[PDB]
Amino acid sequence: VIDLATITKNITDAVAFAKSVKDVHTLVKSIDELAKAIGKKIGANGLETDADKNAKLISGAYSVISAVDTKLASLEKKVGISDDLKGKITTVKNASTSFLTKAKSKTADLGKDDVKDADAKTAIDIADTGAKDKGAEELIKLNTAIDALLTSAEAAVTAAINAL
Amino acid sequence: VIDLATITKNITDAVAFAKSVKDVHTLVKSIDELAKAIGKKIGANGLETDADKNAKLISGAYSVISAVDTKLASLEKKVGISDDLKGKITTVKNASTSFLTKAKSKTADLGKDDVKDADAKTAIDIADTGAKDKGAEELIKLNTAIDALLTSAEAAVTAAINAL
Ligand code: NI
Ligand code: NI
Ligand code: NI
Ligand code: NI
């Protein structure tokens, strides 16, 4: 009296799902690395200060969240996910779309020839002490939503290993 | 007479190692998203063309690979890793150190007030049909090295679940 095939499939499934979620979490976290580059140039010894001219960096962030967005779109579709987890996915996807919509709507500010440090922070820096009025707020919401989904996905992996 | 607990620990350890590896592969792949942004502004409908002024975007990529490099430096140190995997990690960390070294070395090209698209491509765009002479070559190497590490890491997870 025991049971292995079903338990094995359950760990495989839960791990496969966590993989997709983890990949999305990494991408979102990575905007924090891009924010460190606001107003920075590559110099002889690493990043040094060279304020402003940030547009293409924000474009980078936008490109990354685009990929997040596309990945979640595809996750939303996976078969055999619990209603629960599908909901947590939708919350992330909504947050991601939100960020992209906000950024687009601030084209005049974020796409101009010289986006100043302050404004770049309002788009992509979650520790921004300024207004978070050009993406940052939406980025915080995304971070909260993906942290929730990842917590759930990893919980399932743990449960599937210990139900062993 | 199989030892549920040793099998369980091995799944857990292999999965935690893959988690770290996977997070590094995603950070490296993300450079491909950033490259899509070279010479693009955020516009009312998404990225649109706005040539050049790419320095801060390259800084972004630089920042991201710093994070990769740091993560691998920590991985290198994990206890209980097989010599084989350790070697596979070293190949990745070497490649990321290489990238940062090359970028730094091309400061006069990459940190100037107007880095043109072509140049940006030679740093951070692995499908660049131009020279790969300011980072791209090293980024391609990094890509190969982490793909190999990831393949190994994921193989171990599947072995660990299958050994079950
Ligand atoms: Ni300057
Ligand atoms: Ni997070
Ligand atoms: Ni322009
Ligand atoms: Ni790859």
Coordinates of C-alpha atoms and ligand atoms in Angstrom, one line a residue:
Chain A
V1 CA 0.0 0.0 0.0
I2 CA 1.9 3.1 -1.4
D3 CA 1.8 5.2 -4.6
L4 CA 4.6 6.4 -7.1
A5 CA 3.6 7.1 -10.7
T6 CA 0.9 9.7 -9.8
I7 CA 3.2 11.3 -7.3
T8 CA 6.0 11.5 -9.7
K9 CA 3.8 13.1 -12.4
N10 CA 2.6 15.6 -9.8
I11 CA 6.2 16.7 -8.9
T12 CA 7.1 16.9 -12.7
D13 CA 4.0 19.0 -13.4
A14 CA 4.5 21.3 -10.4
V15 CA 8.2 21.8 -11.2
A16 CA 7.5 22.5 -14.9
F17 CA 4.9 25.1 -13.9
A18 CA 7.3 26.6 -11.3
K19 CA 9.9 26.9 -14.0
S20 CA 7.7 29.1 -16.2
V21 CA 6.7 31.2 -13.2
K22 CA 10.3 31.5 -12.0
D23 CA 11.4 32.7 -15.5
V24 CA 8.7 35.4 -15.4
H25 CA 9.7 36.4 -11.9
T26 CA 13.4 36.7 -13.0
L27 CA 12.5 38.9 -15.9
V28 CA 10.5 41.3 -13.7
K29 CA 13.2 41.4 -11.0
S30 CA 15.7 42.2 -13.8
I31 CA 14.1 45.7 -14.2
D32 CA 15.8 46.4 -10.9
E33 CA 19.1 45.8 -12.6
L34 CA 18.2 48.2 -15.5
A35 CA 17.1 50.9 -13.0
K36 CA 20.7 50.7 -11.5
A37 CA 21.8 51.8 -15.0
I38 CA 19.7 55.0 -15.2
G39 CA 22.1 57.9 -15.7
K40 CA 25.1 55.5 -16.0
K41 CA 27.7 54.9 -18.7
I42 CA 30.0 51.9 -19.0
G43 CA 33.4 53.2 -18.0
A44 CA 36.9 51.7 -17.5
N45 CA 35.9 50.2 -14.1
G46 CA 32.2 49.6 -14.4
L47 CA 29.1 51.8 -14.3
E48 CA 29.8 55.5 -13.7
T49 CA 27.6 58.5 -13.6
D50 CA 26.6 60.2 -16.8
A51 CA 23.1 61.5 -16.2
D52 CA 20.2 61.5 -18.5
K53 CA 19.7 60.3 -22.1
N54 CA 17.8 57.4 -20.7
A55 CA 15.1 56.7 -23.4
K56 CA 16.7 53.5 -24.9
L57 CA 17.2 52.1 -21.4
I58 CA 13.4 52.6 -20.7
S59 CA 12.9 51.0 -24.1
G60 CA 14.9 48.0 -22.9
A61 CA 12.7 47.7 -19.8
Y62 CA 9.6 48.0 -22.0
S63 CA 11.0 45.2 -24.3
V64 CA 11.5 42.9 -21.2
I65 CA 8.1 43.5 -19.8
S66 CA 6.8 42.8 -23.3
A67 CA 8.4 39.3 -23.1
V68 CA 6.9 38.8 -19.6
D69 CA 3.6 39.8 -21.0
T70 CA 3.8 37.2 -23.9
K71 CA 5.0 34.5 -21.5
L72 CA 2.0 35.0 -19.2
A73 CA -0.4 35.1 -22.1
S74 CA 0.9 31.6 -22.9
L75 CA 0.8 30.4 -19.2
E76 CA -2.8 31.6 -18.9
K77 CA -3.5 28.9 -21.6
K78 CA -1.9 25.9 -19.9
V79 CA -4.2 22.9 -19.3
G80 CA -4.9 21.4 -15.9
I81 CA -3.9 24.4 -13.8
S82 CA -6.1 25.0 -10.8
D83 CA -8.7 27.8 -11.0
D84 CA -6.7 29.3 -8.1
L85 CA -3.4 29.5 -9.9
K86 CA -5.1 30.7 -13.2
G87 CA -6.4 33.6 -11.1
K88 CA -3.0 34.4 -9.7
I89 CA -1.7 34.3 -13.4
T90 CA -4.4 36.7 -14.6
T91 CA -3.4 39.1 -11.8
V92 CA 0.2 39.1 -13.1
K93 CA -0.9 39.4 -16.8
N94 CA -3.2 42.3 -16.0
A95 CA -0.4 44.0 -14.1
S96 CA 2.0 43.4 -17.1
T97 CA -0.4 44.8 -19.7
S98 CA -1.0 47.7 -17.3
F99 CA 2.7 48.6 -17.2
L100 CA 2.9 48.5 -21.1
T101 CA -0.2 50.6 -21.5
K102 CA 1.1 53.2 -19.0
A103 CA 4.5 53.5 -20.6
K104 CA 3.0 53.8 -24.1
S105 CA 0.7 56.5 -22.8
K106 CA 3.8 58.4 -21.5
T107 CA 5.6 58.3 -24.9
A108 CA 6.0 62.1 -24.9
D109 CA 8.0 61.8 -21.7
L110 CA 9.8 58.5 -22.1
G111 CA 10.6 58.5 -25.8
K112 CA 12.0 62.0 -26.1
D113 CA 15.7 62.8 -27.0
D114 CA 16.7 63.3 -23.4
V115 CA 14.9 61.4 -20.7
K116 CA 16.2 62.8 -17.4
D117 CA 17.1 60.5 -14.5
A118 CA 14.1 61.6 -12.4
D119 CA 11.7 60.7 -15.2
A120 CA 13.3 57.3 -15.9
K121 CA 12.9 56.5 -12.3
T122 CA 9.2 57.2 -12.5
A123 CA 9.0 54.5 -15.2
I124 CA 11.2 51.7 -14.1
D125 CA 12.5 52.2 -10.6
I126 CA 10.4 50.5 -7.9
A127 CA 12.4 52.4 -5.1
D128 CA 11.6 55.7 -6.8
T129 CA 11.0 58.4 -4.1
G130 CA 9.5 60.6 -6.8
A131 CA 6.0 60.2 -8.3
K132 CA 5.7 56.7 -9.7
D133 CA 3.6 58.2 -12.5
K134 CA 5.3 56.8 -15.7
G135 CA 5.3 53.1 -15.1
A136 CA 6.9 52.6 -11.6
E137 CA 3.6 52.2 -9.8
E138 CA 2.5 49.6 -12.4
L139 CA 5.9 47.9 -12.0
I140 CA 5.4 47.6 -8.3
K141 CA 2.0 46.1 -8.8
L142 CA 3.5 43.6 -11.2
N143 CA 6.2 42.7 -8.7
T144 CA 3.6 42.0 -6.0
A145 CA 1.5 39.9 -8.4
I146 CA 4.4 37.8 -9.7
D147 CA 5.8 37.3 -6.1
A148 CA 2.3 35.9 -5.2
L149 CA 2.2 33.6 -8.1
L150 CA 5.8 32.3 -7.5
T151 CA 5.0 31.7 -3.8
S152 CA 2.0 29.6 -4.9
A153 CA 3.9 27.7 -7.6
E154 CA 6.8 26.9 -5.3
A155 CA 4.4 25.9 -2.5
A156 CA 2.9 23.3 -5.0
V157 CA 6.4 21.9 -5.7
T158 CA 7.0 21.6 -2.0
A159 CA 3.6 19.9 -1.4
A160 CA 4.1 17.5 -4.3
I161 CA 7.6 16.5 -3.0
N162 CA 6.4 16.0 0.6
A163 CA 3.1 14.3 -0.3
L164 CA 5.7 11.7 -1.6
Chain B
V1 CA 14.1 -1.3 0.3
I2 CA 14.2 2.2 -1.2
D3 CA 15.0 5.3 1.0
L4 CA 12.2 7.8 0.4
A5 CA 14.1 10.4 2.3
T6 CA 17.4 10.2 0.4
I7 CA 15.4 10.3 -2.8
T8 CA 13.4 13.3 -1.5
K9 CA 16.5 15.3 -0.5
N10 CA 18.1 14.6 -3.9
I11 CA 15.0 16.0 -5.7
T12 CA 15.0 19.1 -3.5
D13 CA 18.7 19.8 -3.9
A14 CA 18.6 19.2 -7.7
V15 CA 15.5 21.5 -8.0
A16 CA 17.1 24.3 -5.9
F17 CA 20.3 24.1 -8.0
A18 CA 18.2 24.3 -11.2
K19 CA 16.4 27.3 -9.8
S20 CA 19.7 29.2 -9.5
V21 CA 20.8 28.0 -12.9
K22 CA 17.5 28.8 -14.5
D23 CA 17.6 32.3 -13.0
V24 CA 21.0 32.9 -14.6
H25 CA 19.8 31.6 -18.0
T26 CA 16.8 34.0 -17.9
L27 CA 19.0 37.0 -17.1
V28 CA 21.3 36.1 -20.0
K29 CA 18.4 35.5 -22.5
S30 CA 17.0 38.9 -21.4
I31 CA 19.8 40.6 -23.1
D32 CA 18.0 39.6 -26.3
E33 CA 15.0 41.6 -25.2
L34 CA 17.2 44.6 -24.6
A35 CA 18.8 44.3 -28.0
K36 CA 15.3 44.5 -29.6
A37 CA 15.2 48.0 -28.0
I38 CA 18.4 49.4 -29.7
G39 CA 17.4 52.5 -31.6
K40 CA 13.8 52.3 -30.4
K41 CA 11.7 54.7 -28.4
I42 CA 8.5 53.9 -26.5
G43 CA 5.8 55.3 -28.6
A44 CA 2.0 55.6 -28.3
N45 CA 1.7 52.0 -29.7
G46 CA 4.9 50.3 -28.5
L47 CA 8.5 50.5 -29.5
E48 CA 9.1 52.5 -32.7
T49 CA 12.2 53.5 -34.5
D50 CA 14.3 56.3 -33.1
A51 CA 17.9 55.7 -34.1
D52 CA 21.0 55.8 -31.9
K53 CA 21.6 57.3 -28.4
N54 CA 22.0 53.8 -27.0
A55 CA 24.6 54.1 -24.3
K56 CA 22.3 53.8 -21.3
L57 CA 20.6 50.7 -22.9
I58 CA 24.1 49.1 -23.1
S59 CA 24.6 50.2 -19.5
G60 CA 21.5 48.2 -18.7
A61 CA 22.8 45.1 -20.4
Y62 CA 26.0 45.6 -18.6
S63 CA 24.2 45.9 -15.3
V64 CA 22.3 42.7 -16.0
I65 CA 25.4 40.7 -16.8
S66 CA 27.0 42.1 -13.6
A67 CA 24.1 40.5 -11.7
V68 CA 24.7 37.2 -13.6
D69 CA 28.4 37.4 -12.8
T70 CA 27.6 37.9 -9.1
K71 CA 25.1 35.1 -9.0
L72 CA 27.6 32.6 -10.6
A73 CA 30.3 33.7 -8.2
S74 CA 28.0 32.5 -5.5
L75 CA 27.1 29.3 -7.3
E76 CA 30.8 28.5 -7.8
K77 CA 30.9 28.3 -4.0
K78 CA 27.9 25.9 -3.4
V79 CA 28.8 22.8 -1.3
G80 CA 28.1 19.3 -2.5
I81 CA 28.1 20.2 -6.3
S82 CA 29.8 17.6 -8.4
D83 CA 33.1 18.5 -10.0
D84 CA 31.5 18.3 -13.4
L85 CA 28.8 20.8 -12.6
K86 CA 31.3 23.1 -10.9
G87 CA 33.4 23.1 -14.1
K88 CA 30.3 23.8 -16.1
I89 CA 29.6 26.8 -13.8
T90 CA 33.2 28.1 -14.2
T91 CA 32.8 28.1 -17.9
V92 CA 29.7 30.3 -17.5
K93 CA 31.4 32.7 -15.0
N94 CA 34.5 32.9 -17.2
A95 CA 32.2 34.0 -20.1
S96 CA 30.4 36.6 -18.1
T97 CA 33.7 38.0 -16.7
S98 CA 34.9 38.1 -20.3
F99 CA 31.8 40.1 -21.4
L100 CA 32.1 42.7 -18.7
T101 CA 35.9 43.0 -19.3
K102 CA 35.4 43.5 -23.1
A103 CA 32.6 46.1 -22.6
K104 CA 34.7 48.0 -20.1
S105 CA 37.5 47.9 -22.6
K106 CA 35.3 49.4 -25.2
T107 CA 34.2 52.3 -23.0
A108 CA 35.1 55.0 -25.6
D109 CA 32.7 53.3 -28.0
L110 CA 30.0 52.2 -25.7
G111 CA 29.8 55.1 -23.2
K112 CA 29.9 58.0 -25.7
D113 CA 27.0 60.5 -25.8
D114 CA 25.7 58.9 -29.0
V115 CA 26.2 55.2 -29.4
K116 CA 24.8 54.3 -32.9
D117 CA 22.7 51.2 -33.5
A118 CA 25.5 49.3 -35.3
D119 CA 27.8 49.7 -32.4
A120 CA 25.1 48.8 -29.8
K121 CA 24.6 45.6 -31.9
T122 CA 28.3 44.7 -31.6
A123 CA 27.9 44.8 -27.8
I124 CA 24.6 43.1 -26.9
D125 CA 23.0 41.7 -30.0
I126 CA 23.8 38.0 -30.5
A127 CA 22.2 37.9 -34.0
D128 CA 24.3 40.9 -35.1
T129 CA 25.4 40.4 -38.7
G130 CA 28.1 43.1 -38.0
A131 CA 31.4 42.6 -36.1
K132 CA 30.8 41.2 -32.7
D133 CA 33.7 43.2 -31.5
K134 CA 32.4 45.1 -28.5
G135 CA 30.7 42.4 -26.4
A136 CA 28.5 40.3 -28.7
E137 CA 31.1 37.6 -29.2
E138 CA 31.4 37.2 -25.5
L139 CA 27.7 37.2 -25.1
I140 CA 27.3 34.4 -27.6
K141 CA 29.9 32.4 -25.6
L142 CA 28.0 33.2 -22.4
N143 CA 24.8 31.9 -24.0
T144 CA 26.4 28.6 -25.0
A145 CA 27.9 28.1 -21.6
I146 CA 24.7 28.8 -19.6
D147 CA 22.7 26.6 -22.0
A148 CA 25.1 23.8 -21.2
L149 CA 24.8 24.4 -17.5
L150 CA 21.1 24.5 -17.6
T151 CA 20.8 21.3 -19.7
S152 CA 22.9 19.6 -17.0
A153 CA 21.0 21.1 -14.1
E154 CA 17.7 20.1 -15.6
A155 CA 19.0 16.6 -16.4
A156 CA 19.8 16.1 -12.7
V157 CA 16.3 17.1 -11.7
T158 CA 14.8 14.6 -14.1
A159 CA 17.2 11.9 -13.0
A160 CA 16.3 12.7 -9.4
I161 CA 12.6 12.4 -10.0
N162 CA 13.1 9.3 -12.2
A163 CA 15.4 7.5 -9.8
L164 CA 12.4 7.7 -7.5
Ligands
NI1 NI 27.1 62.7 -20.7
NI2 NI 10.0 39.6 -6.4
NI3 NI 15.9 60.6 -32.0
NI4 NI 20.0 30.0 -24.1

